[PDB]
Amino acid sequence: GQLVMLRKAQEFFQTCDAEGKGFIARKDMQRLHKELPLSLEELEDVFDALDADGNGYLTPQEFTTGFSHFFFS
Amino acid sequence: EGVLANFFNSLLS
Ligand SMILES: [Ca+2]
């Protein structure tokens, strides 16, 4: 089951990091408000939930790890 | 944890 997860984490990591940086910043999570139906307020909550180490920087492994906790409940 | 579900569930549509 883990391969299907990773295929989605890549898809969704790419979607947030549309600029090709190699990580998701606190401002990629804001421009999602225009594409997804959530308040900016929720988006930063998401962000905050996902940055385990508090860099203010979302890495693929941090992104993939979060999605995997979710994918499996 | 629910706001992650929201955010992921939304990404899935
Ligand atoms: Ca980080």
Hey, how many other C-beta atoms are within 10 angstroms of the C-beta on B6? 17
- The C-alpha atoms of residue A62 and residue A64 are separated, in whole angstroms, by 6
State yes or no: A57 annotated in a binding site.
yes
A67/B7 Cβ within 8 A: no
Asked if A65 reaches chain B (Cβ–Cβ under 8 Å), the answer is no
How many whole angstroms separate alpha carbon A46 and alpha carbon A17?
Answer: 15
| Cβ distance of A42 and B6 shorter than 8 Å | yes
Q: CB burial class (10 A; 0-12, 13-18, 19+) of residue A9?
A: buried
Q: Which long-range contacts (CB under 8 A, 24 or more apart) does A43-51 make?
A: A43/B7, A45/B3, A46/B3, A46/B4, A46/B6, A46/B7, A49/B1, A49/B3, A49/B4, A50/B4
Resolution stated for this PDB structure, in Å: 2.7
Residue listed under structure tokens 């408000």? A33
CA of A61 to the centre of ligand 1 (A): 9
> Measured between alpha carbons, how far is B6 from A39 in angstroms, rounded to an integer?
11
Do A42 and A32 form a contact (C-beta atoms < 8 A)?
A: no
